[PDB]
Design a protein that fits this description.
The chain contains eight helices and twelve strands. The strands form three sheets. Strands 1, 3, 7, 8, 9, 10 and 11 form a seven-stranded mixed β-sheet that branches. The protein is of the alpha+beta class. 29% of the residues lie in helices and 16% in strands. The chain has one domain: Cysteine proteinases (Cathepsin B, Chain A). The longest helix is centred in the N-terminal third of the chain and has 24 residues. A hairpin with a 6-residue loop joins strand 9 and strand 10. The PDB classes it as hydrolase.
Length: 316
């Protein structure tokens, strides 16, 4: 036996139900212990927040019974490499970007998606950037297939649920001459045989453009292009259970990134004191995570979590 907290009994039971957990064997006991440890950690963070020590709060979610190490292995699939250079981003002549930008309100972004238990984040970051560029070009927003990328981009260097790169996904669309719609080739959250059919293709691209490793450059790119694919260090428990506010983690790395996401804007928050700037980011862990699936990440704080280190978008 172990010292399970009797006052958490009801919550544990309801949590398992709301997330349809089926354990058995011996697993229920140790999963409950992982969940209770995560719960205490969330409570400590929020207490410290009330004491003025953090700029964001945390909350229990569908990842409650997982260790950070287990989560990182199953979920975070960005390879953190740059095999081939893309086009050079040419900043506009004598241009100053607006103080805030939100592409969601301009019709460039589809609803939040969920990668499930698969390291396919690279695919979601890629379709998000392509969706924005197709909208810029045609005025039509259509959700694209991540499954198509998972199943068919092996030749380009991607490895399905084991990881990949957004740049490899962009290269596949060019090589292949198209990409099917989400509707015609739905997500299964597992690698299967390629089933690409040109009859249902609704997008195309002719390469990709790279953004320099500078937050000022990334701000100008977001302002003049639309949503941009980026990668960040999402391996900390503070990120796994993020709820709301501006995310800032002292232990984040600007060199070691493992999760591909999408920057859809940027902005600021102010008081007589201070809080400051942020990047508006769309995640692929469903709507129950963070702010309806989004997170505000610290901006202009020495490339926090490597947000400006692996940025690029597709040429349509």
């Amino acid at each position: 036996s172990l010292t399970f907290d009797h006052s958490l009994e009801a919550q544990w039971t309801k949590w398992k139900a709301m997330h349809n957990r089926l354990y058995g064997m011996n697993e229920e006991g140790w999963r409950r212990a992982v969940w209770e440890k995560n719960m205490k950690m969330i409570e400590l963070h929020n207490q410290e927040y009330r004491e003025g020590k953090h700029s964001f709060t945390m909350a229990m979610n569908a990842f409650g019974d997982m260790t950070s190490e287990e989560f990182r292995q199953v979920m975070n699939g960005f390879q953190n490499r740059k095999p081939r250079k893309g086009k050079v981003f040419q900043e506009p002549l004598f241009y100053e970007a607006p103080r805030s930008v939100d592409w969601r309100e301009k019709g460039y972004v589809t609803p939040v998606k969920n990668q499930g238990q698969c390291g396919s984040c690279w695919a979601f970051s890629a379709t998000g950037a392509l969706e924005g560029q197709m909208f810029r070009k045609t005025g039509r927003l259509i959700s694209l297939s991540e499954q198509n990328l998972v199943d068919c981009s092996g030749p380009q260097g991607n490895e399905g649920c084991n990881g990949g790169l957004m740049d490899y996904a962009f290269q596949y669309v060019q090589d292949n001459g198209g990409l099917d719609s989400e509707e015609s080739y739905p997500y299964e959250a597992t690698e299967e045989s390629c089933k690409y059919n040109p009859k249902y293709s609704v997008a195309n691209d002719a390469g990709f453009v790279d953004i320099p490793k500078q937050e000022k450059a990334l701000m100008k790119a977001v302002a003049t292009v639309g949503p941009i694919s980026v990668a960040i260090d999402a391996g900390h428990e503070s990120f796994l259970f993020y709820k709301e506010g501006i995310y800032f983690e002292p232990d984040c790395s600007s060199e070691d990134m493992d999760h591909g996401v999408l920057v859809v804007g940027y902005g600021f928050e102010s008081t007589e004191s201070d809080n400051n700037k942020y990047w508006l980011v769309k995640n692929s862990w469903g709507e129950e995570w963070g702010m309806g699936g989004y997170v505000k990440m610290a901006k202009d704080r020495r490339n926090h979590c490597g947000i400006a280190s692996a940025a690029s978008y597709p040429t349509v």
